[PDB]
Each structure stands twice: as C-alpha cells, then as structure tokens.
Amino acid sequence: DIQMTQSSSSFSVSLGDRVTITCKASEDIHNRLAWYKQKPGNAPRLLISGATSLETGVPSRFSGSGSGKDYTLSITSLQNEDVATYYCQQYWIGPFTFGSGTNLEIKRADAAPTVSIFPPSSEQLTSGGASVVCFLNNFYPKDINVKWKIDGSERQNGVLNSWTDQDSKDSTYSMSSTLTLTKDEYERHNSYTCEATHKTSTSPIVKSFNRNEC
Amino acid sequence: DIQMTQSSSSFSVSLGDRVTITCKASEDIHNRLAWYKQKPGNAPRLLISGATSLETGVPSRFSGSGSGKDYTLSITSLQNEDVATYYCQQYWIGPFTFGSGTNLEIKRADAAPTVSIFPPSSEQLTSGGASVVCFLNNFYPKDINVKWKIDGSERQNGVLNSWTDQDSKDSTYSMSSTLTLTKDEYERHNSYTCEATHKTSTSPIVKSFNRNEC
Amino acid sequence: GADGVGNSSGNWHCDSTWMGDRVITTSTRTWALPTYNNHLYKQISSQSGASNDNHYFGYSTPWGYFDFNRFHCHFSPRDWQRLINNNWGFRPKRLNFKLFNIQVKEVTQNDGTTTIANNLTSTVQVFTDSEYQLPYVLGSAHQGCLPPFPADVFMVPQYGYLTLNNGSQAVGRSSFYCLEYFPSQMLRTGNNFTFSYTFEDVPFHSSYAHSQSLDRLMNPLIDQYLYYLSRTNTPSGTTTQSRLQFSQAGASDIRDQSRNWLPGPCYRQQRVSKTSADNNNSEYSWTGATKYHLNGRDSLVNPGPAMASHKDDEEKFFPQSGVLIFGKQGSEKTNVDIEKVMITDEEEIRTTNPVATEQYGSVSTNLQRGNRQAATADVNTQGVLPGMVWQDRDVYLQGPIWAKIPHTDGHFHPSPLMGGFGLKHPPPQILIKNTPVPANPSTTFSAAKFASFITQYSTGQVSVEIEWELQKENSKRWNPEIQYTSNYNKSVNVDFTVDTNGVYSEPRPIGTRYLTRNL
Amino acid sequence: SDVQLQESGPDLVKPSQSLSLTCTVTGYSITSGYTWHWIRQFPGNKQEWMGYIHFSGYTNYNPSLKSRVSITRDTSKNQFFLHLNSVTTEDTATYYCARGDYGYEWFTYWGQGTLVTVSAAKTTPPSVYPLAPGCGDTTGSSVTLGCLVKGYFPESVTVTWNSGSLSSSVHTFPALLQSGLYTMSSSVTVPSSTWPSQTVTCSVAHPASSTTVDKKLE
Amino acid sequence: SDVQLQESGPDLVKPSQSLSLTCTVTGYSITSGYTWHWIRQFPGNKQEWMGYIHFSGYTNYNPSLKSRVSITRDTSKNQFFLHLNSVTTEDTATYYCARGDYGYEWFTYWGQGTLVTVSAAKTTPPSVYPLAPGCGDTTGSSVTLGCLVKGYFPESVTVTWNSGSLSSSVHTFPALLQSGLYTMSSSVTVPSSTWPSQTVTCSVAHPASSTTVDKKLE
C-alpha cells in the first residue's frame, strides 16, 4: 500500500489567515490525489481532486498543488466554515489510502472561565455514590487546571476532566471536571471546593459549597 | 515564476552601523536584480540596479554584490534616512517578482513610558458604550505590558493594543490600550486602573481614576 | 550505429538548403523524457457522469512518443517565406530521422535535497511502429511536436489511445495494445538510433490563390449563343398574361449566363463577428454550432469542409468552427479571450468553394401552375455533385503537416480536413521509454510485481531532416503579385523573435496562398 | 465542512457476530454511474477505505478486509449494503458510505456515518443525574445547570434540553472511558428569570440499550 | 527612503465591481520613453507586480492577473490607467504606479500609492471620541490629550490636530480590526499653559464614507 504522510498534525488559525498543509506519498502518485475536509461530528467533504482541480461549489480560496511525491493544500483566507480536519487521499492504486489528517482549529482573545460547582444529587447518593462537578465554561486559551480540595486538602483520585472541541462560533473552550467518591466518604466532610487555574489570572477562580447547608 | 527569498526578515540598527541584507533567487537571474527602499507610509525607492550599480543620487554607503542565485545589499554606515524595509526584485523574466523584504528599524537608550489614563466620553456613554484609554508614550525597548483592573480585579476582555512604528527621530515606541465595556457594566464600578509593566522598572507605572469624582 | 561513452553519437545538423527544385530542411533539438505512469499501463475512462457526447474508454502507456507534424518544426520564418512567395505548390518526398547522445540521469531526493547524477549503464529503448499496428495518434492536432525555435528544449509527450466504449465502460471488441510486445531497440549512451522514410506520391499543396472565379470566367466581349429564360409573363394592356420569352446571355446578363462547373460542397456554419457588439448575447457555443453524430454522441464539426470564411468586405466575421485558431504565445488553456488568439482566414477560396456561413444556393420546391405560385428554398448542406470543383484548406506554418488516411472500405478525396497532406502510410509512430531500474530488492524471495524502482529520466538530442519538392511559378501576369512581407515601421519587438526575456513568439499565423494563378 | 446519503444499522454488535449496514441514497440512482464505497474511522481519527461496488455491480475490496467483507446492492430500494463477518473489538468505528465520482476522481458525496461498537463488555445504560446549584446565593442574570450521564458502555448518548427560554447556551462534554465505562456531561445556561420559574429538563437517549431518561432540574 | 507620480481613484469598491485607477505623471512625458507599471501591496507587506504599458503603447501583464487586468493611457493628459475587473476581497491593497528606466533596469520613479479596499462589509463611518484627562490633579508642564476613532470599516482615516501651541508631539496609533470593524487613536502633547487656555481640536476624515468630524477637547 502507498503510505501518505501529512505534515502538521494540527494548526490553530483565525478567520482571514492563510494556511498551508502538506501531504507526501511513499511513491509517485501522479497527481491522483484528493483533499477532503471533515468537521467535528461530521463526515468528510471533497475539496480538491486531481491534485489541483477544485470541486464544484468550492470557494476559490482553496487551492492545491504538487506533483510526484509531494502535494500541498492552501487556504488563502480562512473562513469560519473552514475549521475542520483535512485529509489527503491517493487513488493511484488500490487500496486507496488516506493521510493521518491535519486538524485546523479556527478558533482569539483571552477569556477567563465561568465556573460552577454542583453537589451530588439525591438520586446518586441513594445509590451509594457521590459525584461533585465543576463546569469551567467559555475560556481561552485551552490549557487550564482544576484542583479539588475536600475540607481544605487536595484530592487527586476519582477525577474525570473533559474538554469540548473549539466552539465553531466564539472559538472558546469549556471543561467539565467530576470528582467521584462514595457516599460514605462524602458524608465524612463538609466543604467541597474546586479551584480553576488559568492564564487569565494569578489567583484561581474558586467555587465551593458546604455539605451541611441543607 | 522566479522566487526570491530575503534573509533576515528584520534587523534593528542605529545610525553609523553597517548592515548587510541577502537575497537569493530560485534560478540564475544573471545580475538582473534591483534593490528598493521603502519607508513606512511611503512608496519604494530605487537604490541599486544591475546588482551593483547605484542609482543616481544614491549615497556611496550603499553597495550591492552578487551573481547567479545569491545577491547582497550592504549599507556601510547607517543614516537616519536609512530606516525602511528593503526589497530585492528580479527582472530577468516576466513576471517580475519581489522578495519578502527586510525591515530595518533604525531606532537606543532605555526609556520608561509616559503613561496617561482617560475615562469614557459623555458622547460614548450617551450611545451606551464605555471605553477607557491609556497611552504609554515614548518608551524603549518595544516590549511592554498593560494590565487593566476594575475595582482592583484584572479585566482581560475587551482590549485593543496598538504600537506605533519606531519613531524616525528619537527611535522610541508608543502604545495605545483601550478597554471597552458597556455603559451598564462601567457604571457598576468606581476605580479604573491600567498598570504599565516595562523593562525600565520592577514596579509598574500605575494610573487610575475613580468614576465618582464628577 | 554504436560507440563509446566519451563519444558524441551524432553531430548537430540544423541547416536548410534550397536546390531550385527541392529544398531540404534539416533540424535538431534537445529533449527530455520522464518515466510515465510510474512504468505501468493504466486503464482510463470518461468520468461516469460526464455528458454522453464526452464518454470514452482507453489506456495510457509508460511510453512517450516523438512528433514533428507541424511545419514550423522544419521551416524558419524566413525560409517558409522563401517557399511561400515563389511557388505554385510543394510536397514532401522523403525523410530521415535520428536520435543520439542519449543520456540517462537519476535523481536522488534525499530528505530536503535532490541530487541528479549519471546512471551510465541504464537504458532508454526506442522503436518505430513501421507496420502501423498501433493506434495512430499523430495527426490529431495534439501539442508536443517540435519547438519552432531551435534553441528551445522540450519534453516528450506520453502515448495514450482510445478504443470502443458503451458510455464510460468498455465493450468487448475494444482492443488493448501493449507496447512491449514489439521489438524495441535498446540504447545505452554512445548509442544512436537512425531510420529513414519515403513519402508516397501525393498532390502538391496548392499554394496559390485564384485570379478568376467560377461565375466570372467567360469572355465579356462576346454573348453566348445558348438562350435562357428571360421573362415569363407579359403586358396585356392593364394585366399581365404569362408569355415566356428567352434571351441570349451577354455581359449585362452575366448572372444568367450558362456555365460548366459548380462551386465546391458545403455544410453551413454560424457566423460570429470579431466585433463583440453584433453577436447575439447568450450561450449558443454548443447549442448553435454545426455538428454531426455517431452512435448517438454528437461531436463537433471543427475545420469544417474547406470553405471560404467571409464574403467581400466582412473580414470581421467567421464560422463558429470553420476555421483554424491558434494561441498567441502564452495564451492560457481555457476560455481565453478573443485578444489571446489568432484566427485563420480563408478568403482566398471564395472564388471556388462556398462561403461557410451562407447557403450553397437555392433549389425550387413545388411545381408551379396557373393556380400555384413558383416555390423555392435555400440549401444549407450540399454533398458533392458532378461538375463541382474546389480548393482545400490552406496550410499555415504552424499548422499540421499531414495525417493518416483511415483504413476503410471507402474514402472520398482524403485531403485531411484540418488541412495538410492526406497519407495512406504516414511517417511511422516513433516511441521511447526508459527500461525500468528495480531499486534494491529484498533478500528473501517474493513473487509480486516489482514496484520500487530507481527514480530516473533520460535526455539527449534528436534530429529530423526532410526533402520537399516544389512546383515553381509561371504566369504571364504582368502586374505584381502579392507577397508576404514584414512591416516596415519601427516596433518594440521583432516578429518571430525572442522578447527581452528570451521568449520566442509567432506573431501571426502565416498562410500559403499569395502567388496568383488563374482558374 | 458538508454532504448527502444515509447509513443505518445496529449500533452494537457482539464480537464473533456479523455487522450489517445499509446506505440509502437519495437524489441519485445507484445504477447509471459512480461507485459506492464504504470507509470507516476508528475513534482515534484515521480513515480507512473498506471497498466499493460499481454501478455495474462489480466490487473491489481492501486486501486487509477482503476475507471477511461483502458489499451488495438493492437497486429497487436504491440502497447498498456492507457485511463484515467475524467482528472484533478493533472493528469498532464509525462507518461511512460514499459515492465516487468515477473514472478519474474519488468520493464526491458522503453519509453522516454510523457508530458501531463491538462489545460483549456488556451493554450498560447510563445513570442520569441532574446538576443543580449548590451554593448559598441566588443566581444573578443567568444560571448554569447540567446533567451527568454516568457509567454506560456502548458509546453514544444524546442529551437534549428543554427549557422555558427560547435562547440558551449548551455544552456537550466528550465521553471518556474509565474502568471500562463511559461518563459524559452537558450544561445549559438560561436567564435566571426562567429556570426555577420555568421547567428545564434533560432527555438522555442511549440507543444501544433502548433507553431514554428525562431528568427535570430541581 | 523617497520619489514622484500620483495615483487617484476610489478608495472603496464593491466586490464584483471593477477597479479603476489613474496615475498622473509630472516632470516627464509618457511617450518618448520608459514603461509605466502598476504594482500593489497587500496590507501584510509583499509587493506584487501587476503589469506595464510601454511608451509605444505595448502592454504586458502578470499571468495571474492577465484575464482581468487592462492598462491604458491618455497621452494628452499624461496619465495612464489601470482597470481590474471582478474584484475580490483579496484585491484589497495599496496600488502604486511606477516608471521603469527601461532597457536594462527597472522602476526609477514611484507614486504615493492609493489604498483600495474591496468591501460590500458595509462602509461605516467612525465615532470620534475626545480623550481628556481623567484624574484629580492639574497637569504639570505639559498635557497629553487624544481622540479615539472607533468602529469604522473601510480603512484609512486621517486625524489632524489644531492647538494653540506652535509646538506639539503627535502619535497616530495604527488601526486594528476587531469583530469586522476598525478602531484607531491619536494623541497630542502640548504645554499645559496652552490647552484649557487655548482650544485643541482633532479633525477626523474618513473619505470612504465622505465624513469628517471635528472634536474639541474639553
């Protein structure tokens, strides 16, 4: 099989900028190469075929070039619609093979996270479990940290953190952090706190609640 | 098309120093290469043509050399007039193509910024907006930081910072920082402060005003 | 021929000599040849959906071929001019070909850095299909012939062909020819490949324009003796009463004169004008263009049957597909604007063949009688008729030179329609490929097809000399003929010259009819 | 990013079992042109080409898959099918059907894709817990609520919100596996003047276990 | 840096429209020598050569542009013109006309350049706000004032100051786009003994919208 390798695994870019992606083949493809675009949670779409021919309806901003082993895809001025992962595909010989893909995150200004803490529900406590959650919504850049403290002391075990994909509109990120304990352990303490540490400040955004307040 | 690549993207230099810029062509130009100088907000001017011939009226300090693929422009002793971006151009074949350009910033001693804070105007407040501005004038080096604090707490959103080009005379830089909020949010606080952090000190230059002082 | 490594396998012959009756145009150029389809034959077809009129099925081959079916691969402006200015006609007689100084290089793209070097041993093999067992491609006005300008280096075209197809798919009868199934001769450096050909009695291309014309051909001074139908009805006091009377055609009568021969045939074309204005606004590029159709796919009728491109005073017009059109050096591939092309004009014929845009004549429809007016109708398509006579499309320096007459049960007057010489057995197709170079194989055996070869291409020069015959002028015409000249007035660039950046360019298309012979 | 075509099939399949998917095409006829292909994407990211069926009905398969793949077609229905036998865990992926502008080029139209998970691991429905404010202060202008969807297995659940406000901000957090089970969450922000006042409910659907649980907030 | 030649033309053009610019030359005749060229610079920085017209009237164009560019001349007026059809946003740039010492070398004289923006984005005039000291202390030796020019679109505004002092220090801050609109500012420092005492006014001109707004400080 012919192996295709794509250059940058990921790029971040904003509307208006020019981006270039590269794809090289293990053997001479003879311009039988196509480029596809894939949005998150979406299927791929055909941008270019024959290395340089634009598919119908594709905007002129997209262009492709290359020959032999190396090909390139260029986007003159990025548009919001442009966020997606791009794959190159060779159809010189079977089996057809795809490149690893390049993720283009288009989306911005720094934004501090809106933080919210949530105690365990009665339904979960009934089943013997106890999960405390903290949502850190609409922030940028992506890198963020959450510290869980039970009665002032950190807790490292029982944590699940999930970041969302970059927002297609405002280009911010959100993160959900859940600390799971048993109902027994949970009822052994009062104050539950999550501290969000982000670039937008020196002092962490801190939220908490006391288990005997109800 | 023949592609021209210019070496240093940017150089900083002071009057009297010697500077050298390089330009290389994708293919043999045969000394059909010219050098141009362009000041900010100004159009380009012809320094040298034929790789080594000085244009009439050009000072002897400028000189060019090269052959084949690689050419170089040298300025023996920089003059104040010399600040500008320099481009090489090939006229071996059509279409004529230019290099990316090299920015020569000529202008110096460290200088702390003169800082000024300005409240929103009545005219803007009338329209429902509220922009607070801080001018940080005549400083060096270029790198500087402005922190906006509303009632003591930092504010990261709604900021526009613009640096000027290096001053053609004193070689310093100035920067304008605007924090835009809505009139509603603005009237929710009293003290507005901008802290300027620069190389010239450990303690930031701080300016501020209280919204109920009028 | 054969020899060593430090030995030029041939010299550079690029002259042109006139002998009064013959004239030999020798010519050599440097070329280059890559390795196509990465060494394999690939099946190829139309794009599934694509309009039916555009389907196809066939193959592309790792083989590249040679071609000089363009007059300017042999004539140099000047030369051509000599010819074209003092000869009632001319034709090709024999030729001689030779490839030599072949050299095989091998590029090495190690990381960010390529490095070409000599692969001395490796070979390039050539072979001429002298038995015409291969789909004759040349003659199809393809582009990849020789550079008009010597100094120009060129790339060799790749061989591909087409068989039968039922839409985008193959049909059994369709054949698949394999180029290795021939006995290629293998050249290594110090090796050359020569071969020679001889043309077959063909007619001298008529390189003259006619002074008389079919209609105006008899002698003014004398009225004929045959009578024609002058009038039908006649004055009867107030009213006319039918009474046919006849007259004897004279000079004043001319239009009515009796004759002996008919204009060439025709196939009506739409008229368009060089003047944007006039032209109806819309898309009748395809919809309105004259065409024909086989097996349900309408194809275009380009280079329509030879017929004059515009009546007197209308150099501004032309057929939609009745003329030859070349690009001005540089002109891009598609939808380029009128200003980027050079359109040929065939007014010179007017005298014998019909005008492309206007009907042949007009035949009568009904049979008249007292209670029935005389009908009539114009004819837009007239197939050959006895007594018809005509002229074939002129040639043009940068035009085709010849074309193979298809092997069929029947042909009718084979002057190729795109113009040129119609040959039964034309100059055989010459092919060339680079014997593959298996790059490093694995120690342990595998019976799979080899797929990893050494990256490499070839180069070297090629030479073609051809002997043409001539028919010299000979008219008692007193007053000066027309000749082809170059403009006197100053110009920023000489015609048929290299610009400031050394880019040779042909300013205009140059025909062949200048000298004037009577009809 | 964008396209047309629809795939259908079971979300869950037991290992040694066979996977069968159907692709229904609209706006075009399976005969008369184009080859219809099947491609799959493992959860990591890569795309892999499985094989195709021509308008004429001829098929070609990827050599890796060839032994256990079969592609067929039903012209009447305008559908083409994929059958993959002897499924393994590695087979878990999103399967797409796509059209191939044929002759010279490739895949012009793609389907939405269907996620297929191969597990015996046992199919487990999620436990859905409402996330309502825990603090000693009444909300300001707007309020954020959520729903934790915990301990389910075959991937893919869908959280749908129902609120009073015709304007809201929703965040669906990507599911992550820990100790062999999936957990995910979702949040919604609405005007404070519309929640305790007007009911907000999250509806969680887990097709793999034929479950759907609605949790009202508060 | 320095030169001569002047370009003129509209600052704003709608997309599919055609751009027409004129270059008027003085101190030299368009005929008799030299080729007159057109070059453009995108806001980022690069220079691109569009094409030229010879003294004889012959023209050559860049292949990229060739299909939609036309260069003509009016000898009587001593002007040469540029026409670019089917303009796109990419066409936004500063356009320069230049003379080419011909034969061996190139561009001896250049024009000032004219900025042309291609936008439908809608042309929007700026809101000009006066920046006067906000503090509880009277100024020392000199005072800094300014003017914020906010939310306008087609680039290029010109802030001109008018003060009592015949000596001042002015800073024009480069315009920057945020959310599809431009914002810029300018500052002036004058002797404290001349401001509240003698009027200072900023005049802001935005040719694209045929506007000019003067704001007196204080």
Residues near A212 by beta carbon (within 8 Å), at least 6 away in sequence: A190
Phi and psi (nearest 5°) for D175? -65, 140
Rounded Cα–Cα distance for residues A167 and A105 (Å): 9
For residue C148, the number of C-alpha atoms closer than 13 Å in the C-beta half-sphere is: 25
Classify residue C450 by its DSSP letter: P
Resolution in A: 8.5
Classify residue A81 by its DSSP letter: G
E90 touches chain A (CB under 8 A): yes
**Pairing between strand D19-24 and D47-53?**
unpaired
* C290 and C321 Cβ atoms separated by less than 8 Å: yes
Length of chain C as a residue count: 519
By C-alpha distance, the chain A residue nearest E44 is: A17
Q: Which two tokens stand for residue E133?
A: 């000291």
DSSP states of B63-78 as a string?
EEEEETTEEEEEESS-
Rounded Cα–Cα distance for residues A30 and C36 (Å): 9
Q: 3-state SS of C264-299?
A: CCEECCCEEECCCCCCCCCCCCCCCCCEEEECCEEE
**Pairing between strand B53-54 and B62-67?**
unpaired
CB < 8 Å to A110, chain B: 156-157
- Residue entry with tokens 């706190």: A193
Please, what is the end-to-end C-alpha distance for chain D in angstroms? 39
Classify residue B122 by its DSSP letter: H
* E strand map for chain E: 6-8, 12-13, 19-24, 35-41, 47-53, 59-61, 69-74, 79-84, 93-100, 107-110, 114-118, 127-131, 142-152, 158-162, 169-178, 181-191, 201-206, 211-216
Rounded Cα–Cα distance for residues C68 and C25 (Å): 12
* D59 and D80 Cβ atoms separated by less than 8 Å: no
User: Is there a contact between E66 and C492 if contact means CB atoms under 8 Å apart?
Assistant: no
DSSP states of C14-74 as a string?
--EEE-SSEEEE--EEEEEE--GGGG--EEEE--TTS-GGG--EEEEEEEEEE---BGGGT
Q: Which two tokens stand for residue B6?
A: 């210019």
* E82 and E21 Cβ atoms separated by less than 8 Å: yes
Rounded Cα–Cα distance for residues E118 and E10 (Å): 10
* D19 and D87 Cβ atoms separated by less than 8 Å: yes
In sign, the C-alpha dihedral spanning E25, E31, E32, E36 is positive
Question: How does E85-124 read in b/e, with b if 16+ C-beta sit within 10 Å?
Answer: eebeeebbbbbbbbbbbbeebbbbbbbbbbbbbbbeeebb
Number of domains in chain C: 1
Helix H or strand E encompassing C124: strand C124-128
Phi and psi (nearest 5°) for B123? -60, -40
CB < 8 Å to B92, chain C: 501
Question: How does B172-210 read in b/e, with b if 16+ C-beta sit within 10 Å?
Answer: bbbbbbbbbbeeeebeeeeebbbbbbbeeeeeebebebb
Chains that touch B (3 or more CB pairs under 8 A): A, C, E
- Residue entry with tokens 């034709």: C91
* 3-state class (DSSP) for residue E109: strand
Phi and psi (nearest 5°) for C506? -90, 110
- Residue entry with tokens 């297929």: D116
* C267 and C353 Cβ atoms separated by less than 8 Å: no
* C435 and C39 Cβ atoms separated by less than 8 Å: no
Q: Which two tokens stand for residue C294?
A: 């086989």
According to DSSP, the residues that pair with B163 across neighbouring strands are B175
Q: Which two tokens stand for residue A172?
A: 């911010």
* E strand map for chain B: 4-6, 10-13, 19-25, 33-38, 44-49, 53-54, 62-67, 70-75, 84-90, 97-98, 102-106, 114-118, 129-139, 145-150, 153-155, 159-163, 173-182, 191-197, 205-210
Give the other-Cβ count within 10 Å of C235's Cβ. 9
| Burial of residue A26, with CB atoms counted within 10 A of its CB: 0-12 exposed, 13-18 middle, 19 or more buried | middle
* 3-state class (DSSP) for residue A186: helix
Could you tell me which of E91, E92, E109, E87 has the C-alpha nearest to residue E100?
E109
Give the other-Cβ count within 10 Å of D36's Cβ. 26
State yes or no: chains A and D have 3 or more CB pairs below 8 A. Answer: yes
Q: Which two tokens stand for residue C428?
A: 């055989």
Q: What is the CATH number of the domain that holds C102?
A: 2.170.30.10
DSSP states of D90-120 as a string?
GG-EEEEEEEE--TT--EEEE---EEEEE--
C330 touches chain E (CB under 8 A): yes
Q: Which two tokens stand for residue B169?
A: 């005379």
Q: 3-state SS of C71-89?
A: HHHCCCHHHHHHHHHCEEE
D148 touches chain A (CB under 8 A): yes
**Pairing between strand A84-90 and A33-38?**
antiparallel
Could you tell me which of D9, D16, D151, D160 has the C-alpha nearest to residue D93?
D9
By C-alpha distance, the chain C residue nearest A27 is: C452
* 3-state class (DSSP) for residue E193: helix
CB < 8 Å to C46, chain D: 103
By C-alpha distance, the chain D residue nearest A138 is: D171
Phi and psi (nearest 5°) for C450? -70, 135
Classify residue B170 by its DSSP letter: T
A96 touches chain D (CB under 8 A): yes
Q: Which two tokens stand for residue C467?
A: 């002997």
**CA–CA distance from C163 to each of A66, A91, C167, C176 (Å)?**
31, 23, 12, 8
Phi and psi (nearest 5°) for C294? -110, 145
Residue in E1, E48, E187 nearest the CB of B137? E187
Residue C224: left (phi > 0), alpha (psi -120 to 50), or beta? beta
Rounded Cα–Cα distance for residues D83 and D70 (Å): 5
DSSP states of C330-391 as a string?
T--SSS--GGGEEE---GGGTTTSPPTTS-SEEE--S--BTTB----EEESEE---TTB---
* C230 and C206 Cβ atoms separated by less than 8 Å: no
The CA distance from C453 to the nearest CA of chain A, in Å, is 10
CA angle B111, B115, B119 (to 5 degrees): 165
Residues near C489 by beta carbon (within 8 Å), at least 6 away in sequence: none
Classify residue D193 by its DSSP letter: G
Rounded Cα–Cα distance for residues D40 and C465 (Å): 60
E139 touches chain B (CB under 8 A): no
Residue D51: left (phi > 0), alpha (psi -120 to 50), or beta? left
For chain C, the farthest-separated pair of C-alpha atoms sits apart, in whole angstroms, at 115
* D209 and D124 Cβ atoms separated by less than 8 Å: yes
- Residue entry with tokens 């292949």: E63
Phi and psi (nearest 5°) for C247? -130, 170
- Residue entry with tokens 């002797």: E191
* C402 and C395 Cβ atoms separated by less than 8 Å: no
Classify residue E146 by its DSSP letter: E
Q: Which two tokens stand for residue C448?
A: 């799979």
CA angle C97, C101, C107 (to 5 degrees): 125
Length of chain B as a residue count: 214
Could you tell me which of D78, D74, D13, D21 has the C-alpha nearest to residue D50?
D21
* C162 and C58 Cβ atoms separated by less than 8 Å: yes
Could you tell me how many helices (H) and strands (E) chain A has, helices first? 2, 19
Helix H or strand E encompassing B184: helix B183-186
According to DSSP, the residues that pair with E170 across neighbouring strands are E188
Rounded Cα–Cα distance for residues C398 and C328 (Å): 12
A79 touches chain E (CB under 8 A): no
Rounded Cα–Cα distance for residues C328 and C74 (Å): 20
A74 touches chain E (CB under 8 A): no
- Residue entry with tokens 């706000």: E129
Classify residue D122 by its DSSP letter: -
Chain centre to alpha carbon of residue C330? 20
Length of chain A as a residue count: 214
Phi and psi (nearest 5°) for A83? -55, 130
Which A residues in the span 160-199 are in contact with D, Cβ-Cβ below 8 Å? 160, 162-165, 174-176, 178
Q: Which two tokens stand for residue A155?
A: 């807790």
Helix H or strand E encompassing B186: helix B183-186
- Residue entry with tokens 């059994």: C172
Give the other-Cβ count within 10 Å of D8's Cβ. 13
Q: Which two tokens stand for residue D78?
A: 């305008």
Classify residue C425 by its DSSP letter: S
Rounded Cα–Cα distance for residues C223 and A204 (Å): 118
* 3-state class (DSSP) for residue C474: coil
Breaks in chain C after (C-N > 2.5 angstroms): none
Rounded Cα–Cα distance for residues A114 and C70 (Å): 75
Give the other-Cβ count within 10 Å of A212's Cβ. 7
By C-alpha distance, the chain A residue nearest D7 is: A43
User: Is there a contact between C168 and D101 if contact means CB atoms under 8 Å apart?
Assistant: no
- Residue entry with tokens 């950190």: A154
Q: Residue C489 sits in which domain range?
A: 1-519
- Residue entry with tokens 């509240």: E196
Rounded Cα–Cα distance for residues C362 and C378 (Å): 4
Phi and psi (nearest 5°) for D91? -70, -10
CB < 8 Å to A76, chain E: 90
Amino acid at E162: N
Residues near A181 by beta carbon (within 8 Å), at least 6 away in sequence: A129, A130, A131, A132, A150, A155, A158
**Pairing between strand E12-13 and E114-118?**
parallel
Rounded Cα–Cα distance for residues B19 and B82 (Å): 10
Rounded Cα–Cα distance for residues A4 and D62 (Å): 16
